Design a protein around this ligand. Sequence first.
Ligand code: A1CJX
Length: 167
Amino acid sequence: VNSFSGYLKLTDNVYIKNADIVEEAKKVKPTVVVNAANVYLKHGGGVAGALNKATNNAMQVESDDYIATNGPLKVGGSCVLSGHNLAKHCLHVVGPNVNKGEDIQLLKSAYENFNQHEVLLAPLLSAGIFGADPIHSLRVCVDTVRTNVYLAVFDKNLYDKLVSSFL
Ligand SMILES: C[C@@H](C(=O)O)[C@H](NC(=O)c1ncnc2[nH]ccc12)c1ccccc1
């Protein structure tokens, strides 16, 4: 049993809600919140900008030290950093950005990072401003993640479209 409320059950392990991931994190304080990061951990907009703003820029400060020490992530890769005031940990996951010309086949690899954590609050990777088909991303999520994932979809029209088209 956990604290996530009002999520629609899609499969044995995947649940979905039309919600702002920042507000969900502030309410539940999950062990892991997933950020839709880029390889440089530059948290400018989207999920990343919103999470970072909610941490008063502490996420960015921590991320800059991470990159200075370790260099950029891989597309499809991840790192575990602090969740600051929002969660115990933040799993920064890099899905491919189609608007940058990156390979959508890497989306499965990106979702595989979720399997290292028993429960996660997460966004829909590579969708929205990352340019990929959101129906496809949800399919890859359900067909790749085996641990318990609570998906928070910001856009209301998108949420309705995803639910109504889900197989
Ligand atoms: C799909 C899309 C959505 O769920 O609509 C999602 N975006 C957000 O979650 C979002 N965007 C901008 N400002 C925000 N503030 C609070 C949340 C939030 C998203 C997922 C992966 C990559 C980029 C974007």
